[model samples]
Target chain A: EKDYVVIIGSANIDVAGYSHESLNYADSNPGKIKFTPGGVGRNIAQNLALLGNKAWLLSAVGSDFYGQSLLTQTNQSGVYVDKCLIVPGENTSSYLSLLDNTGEMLVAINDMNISNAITAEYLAQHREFIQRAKVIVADCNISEEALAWILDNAANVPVFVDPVSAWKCVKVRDRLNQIHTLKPNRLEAETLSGIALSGRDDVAKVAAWFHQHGLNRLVLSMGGDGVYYSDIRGENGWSAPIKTNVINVTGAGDAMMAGLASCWVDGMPFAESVRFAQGCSSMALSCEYTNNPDLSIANVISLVENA
Target chain B: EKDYVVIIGSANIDVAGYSHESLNYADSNPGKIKFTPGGVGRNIAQNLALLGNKAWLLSAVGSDFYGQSLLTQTNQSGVYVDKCLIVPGENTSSYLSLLDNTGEMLVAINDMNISNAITAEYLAQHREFIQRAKVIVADCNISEEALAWILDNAANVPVFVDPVSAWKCVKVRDRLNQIHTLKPNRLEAETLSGIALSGRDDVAKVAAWFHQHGLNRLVLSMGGDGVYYSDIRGENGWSAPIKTNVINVTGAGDAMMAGLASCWVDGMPFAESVRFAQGCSSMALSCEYTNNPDLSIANVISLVENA
Candidate 1:
């Protein structure tokens, strides 16, 4: 069976450099730079492809060097980046930074010059493809107009939107109502829902604002505590937390979302869905980076079954 | 001044998926797989480029998908792979592995099908470019015939040959005479020279054999015991090891080589040469991987001159 998972969002190449301390910018020399195949939608699409499911990354990446490298690398990872609108004389999105002592990011420089150029008109031009997508997963990295356009076209499909970074989530505050599924972190939940949350009850309370507003279902992640899910189907709610010794919390959210999407597409219930999501997230903490969790569906099933 | 540092050796695209233990080949599931630019020669080329050197990587990578990505990413990193002898109809060299809790690689499946295809004739054919190189370097991971041919045709330029692992060093034993400078870890030295070393003096004794055998210089790295070098030319012998708090040890050899190469080409004295090498190496260990060694050339020189 051919299953299509189309993700349209900003595409980026991630460059990671490790350092001992934040040295003087004037004297600091870069230690070792490890370049991996990355970008939000590309990361998700590749993860899906690794799951043996058909996945496509649709976004704007430059037709230049890094973009070509991104497309080539991600494609070779088994995801199709064909729909990634390539524009000439533009650079694809890129994130470069140093992670210092205590796993804190010292500084990051990101440029999505070309990705932000993906216009609503450009997406509207591809309606035949947009409207027929089985699922459209996105992060709030693309233009708002493009988001609105996708929401309009993928009204019938399960469209999951996420606020990637706490900073990027604020862009969609006014337009958060037209989505089927929304995933926001604790900080993101606070800003997007205009509520400062602290406890377990607050997470459910905060998710209610997101649900009351245009979201059919909400998955609000509170860093270490757990995930709060509000299901609109039976007007029920639940919580799920990754049960594991957290190794590297890099892409836990993306893994959780993908896991939830996996369960949703498989016709699972809310309780089962939370368990599935937490299981994949627990697996995500096992890897070195955030791009791929390195845990299989069977592995997730076993882990969840154990949990 | 721009100088050509030709890195002639194996280059490959790394594809890996981390799992808990050994991969269950019977029921391998896709956790997270990615295609990344990797290879000893490729890594060296990239490092030289970061140091603002006009570097070139001359290796035999395939003209396949992974090969293309490997070349593209290396090129983008400012390393020129245009002179890379690309074999058609074969896949690029790669490795598959699983890492454990301490981030230590447990088992790896190194696939260098294309690396095995690099021939001496292909390298000998590029003698003009090879002769034009001021400083040439390689890892013993390359083929013996190619290594012999490169050294035979290099015509007295500084040829730095690293006897990388036990197996790599053993395979290239016949071509050891062509190297002007030899770098081998204690284990590699034992394998290549077939001499069991005991301590610091013993390691230096092995390095002397390399010099006696035709290698003009030697750097026998004994990990935490520090490094040793020998040159009878008065300007060629011993350097005090730079002591520091050790951290991650991957790429320590390359970092040491970078220090040695920079000073070696500059005709630095034996003591100054290995000190510079040791300092950068000490800094390299403090970091995660091989992109940025905390200390730059200036820092190393300063430490040497001051200490």
Candidate 2:
């Protein structure tokens, strides 16, 4: 049986425009635009497949062209996209952003009404598919009802969770014990644990809070400080990011989560897994796109070896 | 014989965000977005179909999900979408804008590389389809080479051109003789004719310039001054707009074009056609969407009758 990494969440057409100069108010600005398929679960699934893991993406999008494009790209990249909802008459989820001359995000708008399409009833219908996964990874982009349903039904299959944003972390706050593992950025981790993390002691305290809540595995992604991790046996560790010039950090957290999911399933230790995940994230940061097309286990291993 | 309206131009996913206050620069602003399928050609096709004309849309879009959504909606609304280029691996064209508290356009960015995919070679392949149309409508969004090819091959079918923007008007500047009709706002006409118009005399002189260039029919849209028109038979006229409180005026030009195409094909007099076109423009302006779905011959006639 294929030990599939099943991911469930939102899928979006990410459209970003880059302005060459400062934007003038009440006028059309000259800029260049680039678009690609993106979402936390979808990106993780795509990265898992790129790293030679069998991956399945389960999400909801409109039956429109954006939804089809998301499925097409994910399926072509070796991730199975058979479980996605293609809802008719609804516009597919999308994220549009404007970047200033320095490549900083000035403003962003997300249309994710299709995210509500992944109802608890819909996930209940796919219960058997969710149970067969070696690791089930989900993001808070879906409804809280769906997340709680997965936690209650996945039958001990080590569900990993991505708190998609600071606000969305509350969706799984009450169900923390049901989650087998979690990958959240600093703000998400803080939101979930109600702690302000500033240093190593704060990281350890947040990890302890999750451990008490029955989350055996936790990885807190601190953009510049690298990642921090803790496991079931009370072992905690930290891994500094490999030195690399960052071009874009859009999906680095998702890439790191995929790395952790892949490594943890293969029985890598809590400390080693965090280091391996750091290697995975460095490649993503150096690339311009959301998921590095050339990302693979061999590349991560080579970078670790060179380090 | 059915008098079909053949529209050739860009189809876009128009994403507009509205803020309740003045825009604040270099930060995440508060707003709500509304997404709709819009583009000059698609809007005209949609409007023409709604106005009870058999319409065909010939444009280029990516083979992705956005393209499918556009084709599906246009097709469902009775526009023939079979002739559009569904280019593989490219993203569909999109326009994203931000509106201020007053619901006026603040800034916008466009990603329309897919429009260039409708090449001269691509249009050449649709020669038979173009030749069969009663009236061929095109906007300046497509490539200049493609526009030139349509002019050469569409036989005697009247080619109605919309100068989509000032820069894009250059595409048909030298090929005015091949254009059977033209709809240019004041700025675009000035760009094409290289003469500025501040009053009716200036508009007449510019109309004469086109008449001398072998062009026959023309409609010059002046925002609040109403529309001006002329023909090859030396007849000239103007239509004062019906009084209506204007809202968002995003696609007034497109609605006007569809009105002209719908009325012209039915043999309505030039002066009456412009007035009917004004009714269409008013409906688009009063409503929030790109094209008013309630727009039909009956509705337009009712508005004109009441006026």
Candidate 3:
């Protein structure tokens, strides 16, 4: 049987505009706008596929121009999108972000109502298809019910969860025991564990709290401070982020999740997996795309070896 | 010979987001977004078609998702889009506007570089096709060279010009004599005629200046002060704006331009044409769409008769 990864999550068209100079509110400003495929689950699946993994993405998209573009691009990236639900009468999920001249986000608007189509019932129908996977990866963009369905039914398959944001991490907190691994930033970890993280000891305490709650593994990203990782087996360590000229930081987390999942499937040791994931993020930081096309096992391993 | 109206200008996809509450700068705001077909020339052409005219749009769009949407929507609205240039590898013109809770624009960004595809060479190549038109409408979105081509080659066909903005009106100033009718708001008139518009006298002086430059007719929109119209024959008057519940004021000018062109095609007198155009604008103001689908000859005439 082929060992493949099945990902359940959101797919979106990202429309971003960057201003040329200081923004003048209430008027037309000269800027450069771009459209690209993006979404937590979709990005991770694409990264995994690029890393030479067989990845299947089970997401919902509307039958519109954006949906077609999203599916076509993700599939072209070697992720299997044939299983994605194409719902009619809904607008495909889209995120419109405006960035200031300083490269900071000015304001944004997201329309993800179509995500409601990815119901628990839809996941149940794909239960057998998902059961064949060696690993399952999901993002918090889906409804709590859908996430619960996956957690309860994954059986022996390792389930990796990405807490997409602090606000969305609430959906995964109560079911930490059902998840085999979780990837969260410091803010999301604080939100999920209900513990304020101030220093290294606080980070260790949070990791211990998650392990106590039944999570087998935890990776807490700390921006420039690096990453802290822990497992139920009492194995834990910190890995510094690889240095690179950061062009865009949009999909670094997704790339990291893909690397971690790929390591788990290959049975790489916990400490080495953390370093490999950091290498993946470094590669992502050097590219503009949410899922850098240049990402591969060779490039990522080379980055880690050099680092 | 068939009497068709040819419009040389731009076609764009308008993406607008309306916030649900007062905007918080530098963060995502809860809002509703809508995509609609818009552009001064496109809107005017669509309005002309809705008003029962054979309107042909001469514009450019990239062979992309937005371009396809713009063409399909415009064609479905009864405008003939067969003449629009589909430039490969170019992005279609798009206008992104963010509106505050009160429905006022907070910021806007427009990408209209595709308008360059509607070059003077392309217009010259269609000389015979354009010569068949009974009237011509052009917006400032097109290049100055393209606009100049229409003015110098339009022959007896009445050339109507929409000074799209105060900044863009400079393109139509030098050859005012070749234009049969010019539609400009107060600011645009001031920019083109080099006369500051402070009061009604200044408005009249601007009209006189346009006429002195050999412009046969001019319609100066004055917002709540209504409209000021002048002809080289010394015919001039002000038509008070029709009262209406304004849902959106975005496409009112384009609809008025359409109304004026339709009236000219029917040989309506200058004064009645102004009132008719006011009625058309009233209809546009009462709807949220850039070009209101309810606009038609009967509705416009009924609005004018009642007003």
Candidate 4:
């Protein structure tokens, strides 16, 4: 009954190309291309399901090959994607990212206009299922109207909000107080809090600011540095990143969010949850699978315990 | 009834990424990505269809979405793809190419495993159709067994062969004399002739070599220098490239091949055919469309007459 996690946001394709060396100007560059299923909400749902959690995705996709394939992959990953909408005519959203040798992104060209197809009306139409969710996770890639509807209806259930990007975080900015947990990277955190962070010491201040504004819990990812976590009860802490040979970092943050969300549902302590999230992040960084398909609770714990 | 040409080889998707500047090492490059329906045989089939010539493709594609969409697009482009097989449990072939700002291909990574589905056994089972084709075109991407079968069975049908690349062209190298018309780029020309071209004089030498070896008609694409062509009937000439601001050059050669094949079926002379092929190449180079969707006899002739 309450076993399912309702994830709502973008669900699309990720097309990426990786280069071998210094890219020459005005000529073809040698490289390999990879196509993977991607989207903030979809990634979180996939990770949670792969980690032995029951997850259901509620997102919009164009009724075409990309959409059909996206749902097939999500369903195979143990996430229930049947409830998702397939909007006609609109092309499925896609992320075309170019990456250099060391996993650093050079550019992101995205077309997610179809995300608007997941509207407040659609959410209201599926209220019974939404009301039954034990925990709900939403990414700001969806329309603001849908985000507002989630905030208003997810009264008692824990609502974990992922600010997908700096530009998108503004969707959830005014309603931060209604959030149960917020996971944001440095730039996204800055956008949400309107506070520019200078150094490591400022981590606690930002977490405190979110708590003071009504967020019951906060988890912020500082890439290569670590994660910062806190609660409204004044409990707060920071952890350093786990050292490992990073293969790719495309889906690390979504995996971290999944780690924390699973822990919170299981009533784990805040400090233990942060460590677990860090372990998942480390695992994602060490693998080439963009969605971290190999991630699981047992493997994450193995990394955490050994660390 | 005999208007349609029979083309046998690969028909698959082409995904390409273009970068704006010299690619940064170890980072995602700022770029744009475009997905187009492509493959050597498919490109020629599509171009011939667009040029008001009926084309029937005999290629292998999986029954999946990529295959389904490939068929749909090829059909839309006026190529009859129904005779093409929909192999179960196989994925469609895909070419992932990276290009620099000037649309020069930097590298190509291709997965054409599905091409083997065009087996000799299948061609034998459909031998009557193969024998009936008035003009048969094929690319070397097909399995050698199938290519061997085509050469053995296509006795009088004008067999137009396109050496897709330097490496793949080796499949058809030993049997060059059996070929009625051969289209090879400079590199492929060097490989087939085993002659290292030193200057413009080598162009005719290579063309004469192919003719000496059994090729009845020969066409060689020399990038920006334009096209060199000749036939065993003593017709020989070279034409300059039609001037245009080249935006994408990926499929220009295939378009030129299509131009020659269509003209040959109509009994056009060698000189007029080269100019017509040059016109098709020009139109393809000026457009961003990877398959040059707007290519047609009317469009190419309009550009040719004005030039």
Models, CA RMSD each: 12.3, 3.2, 3.2, 5.1
Name the runs in model 2 displaced over 4 angstroms. Answer: A20-22, A52-54, A63-65, A86-90, B1-3, B19-31, B63-65, B86-90, B100-102, B152-154, B170-175, B190-214, B244-247
Find the candidate with the highest DockQ and give its number.
2
User: Per-residue lDDT of B1-307 in model 4, one digit per residue for the tens?
Assistant: 4567888979877776666677764444446555678888998899889888879899998766657777887897889998898899666777766666776766555567788899998888778887887788999989888898899888678788988888789888778777888888889999989997768989878887887787888888887787888888898888888887778776888888888888888899888988998898888888877677788788889999976
Candidate 1: pairs in clash: A30-B292, A31-B291, A31-B292, A31-B293, A32-B290, A32-B291, A32-B292, A33-B291
Question: For model 3, what share of native contacts is present?
Answer: 0.46
Q: What is the DockQ of the complex in model 2?
A: 0.41
| Residue lDDT tens for model 4, A84-103 | 99998666777766666775
lDDT of each: 0.68, 0.83, 0.88, 0.82
Ranking by TM-score: 3, 2, 4, 1
Docking class of 4: incorrect
- The residue pairs that clash in candidate 2, if any, are A65-B65, A65-B66, A66-B65, A66-B66
Residue B111, candidate 4: how far off, in angstroms? 6.3
lDDT of 3 by residue, A102-196 (tens): 77887898777677789888888889989889999999999998999999999778899999988888999889999988999989999999899
Q: In order, what are the TM-scores of chain A for the candidates?
A: 0.91, 0.95, 0.97, 0.93
Docking class of 3: acceptable
Model 2: per-residue Cα lDDT at residue B18: 68
Q: Every model's DockQ, to 2 decimals?
A: 0.04, 0.41, 0.40, 0.20
Query: Which model is ahead, 3 or 4, in terms of TM-score?
Result: 3
Worst 10 residues of 1 chain A by lDDT: A24-33
